[PDB]
């Protein structure tokens, strides 16, 4: 359907990112095959040849310092040279981390791939893009790794984008991974130039990463007050109706009022139907509709960054549907909310109405 003036979608994927692995447990859910399966599905669905292929690169240590401490950079960098006993001991210093000799390099490639993709978008080489990267990023804090994440790819990309345009570039990060992006929240908690909106299974703080920082009443600090939006789910499985309602009532009104100039999606697919770690029911068509809504922001400048997601079929179908939307395909055809989901949405509305006229 696309013709000479149709917008272009970028895609980054590099099999080097498969080298990070759990050397003790080949069945750990954060598998190398996550990215190769998503990439394969893009070939099967004839999406790859429709995209402009963006190369990966490594992030530099100076770029990592946009968000991370010198200590954290140094320690993770040192893991490249460690023997298994030390890799095991180092990983045990963090919550839910495994490390191999290739982990640091893979984390650098995930970040650099997203920097290249943001650069392609912001220079107009492509309109939007998809980054099929691992390890994930959103639990990584300034000073520590966490939850399968070493460096905060999305947060770094936001800063990188500002560094190659202007400091005030308004970046929206929408984090639809089923888990709260604690690191992204904290990195930007005092920042009004980066709006963080997370939807996540919360369960009154019982669900990983197990902190009440993920609740709706954490709205940001100082100049960042209002610029941190947590949409926490309690009461078990949520799906398309709840996510569509959260987008309709919260994500899209706040985002439109913020008027981002770049949208980054921390696109985990662990809220997907079939995911045994998330336990939720978002369908591929649901993810397509979320993507299509975000495309209406920022003059279409959207970068979808893989985070979590552990059912290989589910993530492959879901991320492919997102790319299909970015490419301009028609959204697929797509109910009362769970009672607790209405409660959650109304709690966020109460918390953020003081800051966002679109909600009053
Ligand atoms: C860290 C995490 C999710 C991160 C994510 O997706 N962050 O966005 C999930 C942990 C709690 C988990 O559920 C788990 C389950 C099985 C397992 N093995 C079978 C080895 C190891 C860990
Ligand atoms: Cl193809
Ligand atoms: Cl050893
Ligand atoms: Cl390399
Ligand atoms: K999230
Ligand atoms: K913020
Ligand atoms: Mg600033
Ligand atoms: Zn997750």
Automatic annotation (TrEMBL):
Q: What is this protein called?
A: Protein deacetylase HDAC6
Residues annotated to bind Zn(2+): 177, 179, 270
- At the top level, the lineage of the source is Eukaryota
Membrane spanning residue stretches: none
* Family the UniProt entry places it in: Belongs to the histone deacetylase family. HD type 2 subfamily.
The compartments listed are: Cell projection, Axon; Cell projection, Dendrite; Cytoplasm, Cytoskeleton, Cilium basal body; Cytoplasm, Cytoskeleton, Microtubule organizing center, Centrosome
């Amino acid at each position: 359907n696309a013709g000479g003036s149709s917008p272009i979608t970028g895609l980054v994927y590099d099999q080097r990112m498969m080298l990070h692995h759990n050397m003790w447990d080949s069945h750990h859910p954060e598998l190398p095959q996550r990215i190769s399966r998503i990439f394969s599905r893009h070939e099967e669905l004839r999406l790859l040849s429709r995209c402009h292929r963006i190369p990966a690169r490594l992030a530099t240590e100076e770029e990592l310092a946009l968000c991370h401490s010198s200590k954290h950079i140094s320690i993770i960098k040192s893991s490249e040279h460690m023997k298994p006993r030390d890799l095991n001991r180092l990983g045990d210093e963090y919550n839910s981390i495994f490390i191999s000799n290739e982990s640091y390099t893979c984390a650098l490639l995930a970040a650099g791939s997203c920097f290249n993709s943001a650069q392609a978008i912001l220079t107009g080489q492509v309109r939007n893009a998809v980054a099929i990267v691992r390890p994930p990023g959103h639990h990584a804090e300034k000073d520590t790794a966490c939850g399968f994440c070493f460096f905060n790819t999305a947060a770094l990309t936001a800063r990188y984008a500002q560094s190659i345009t202007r400091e005030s570039l308004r970046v929206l990060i929408v984090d639809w991974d089923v888990h709260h992006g604690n690191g992204t929240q904290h990195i930007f908690e005092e920042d009004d130039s980066v709006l963080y909106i997370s939807l996540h299974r919360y369960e009154d703080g019982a669900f990983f990463p197990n902190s009440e920082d993920a609740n709706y009443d954490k709205v940001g600090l100082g100049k960042g007050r209002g610029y941190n939006v947590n949409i926490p789910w309690n009461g078990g499985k949520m799906g398309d109706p709840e996510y569509m309602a959260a987008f309709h009532h919260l994500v899209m009104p706040i985002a439109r009022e913020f008027a981002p100039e770049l949208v980054l999606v921390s696109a985990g697919f662990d809220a997907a139907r079939g995911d045994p770690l998330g336990g939720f029911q978002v369908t591929p068509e649901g993810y397509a509709h979320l993507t299509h809504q975000l495309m209406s922001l920022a003059a279409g400048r959207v970068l979808i960054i893989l985070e979590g997601g552990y059912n290989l079929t589910s993530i492959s179908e879901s991320m492919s549907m997102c790319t299909s939307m970015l490419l301009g395909d028609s959204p697929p055809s797509l109910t009362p909310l769970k009672t607790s989901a209405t409660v959650s949405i109304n709690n966020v509305l109460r918390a953020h109405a003081p800051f966002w006229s679109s909600l009053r």
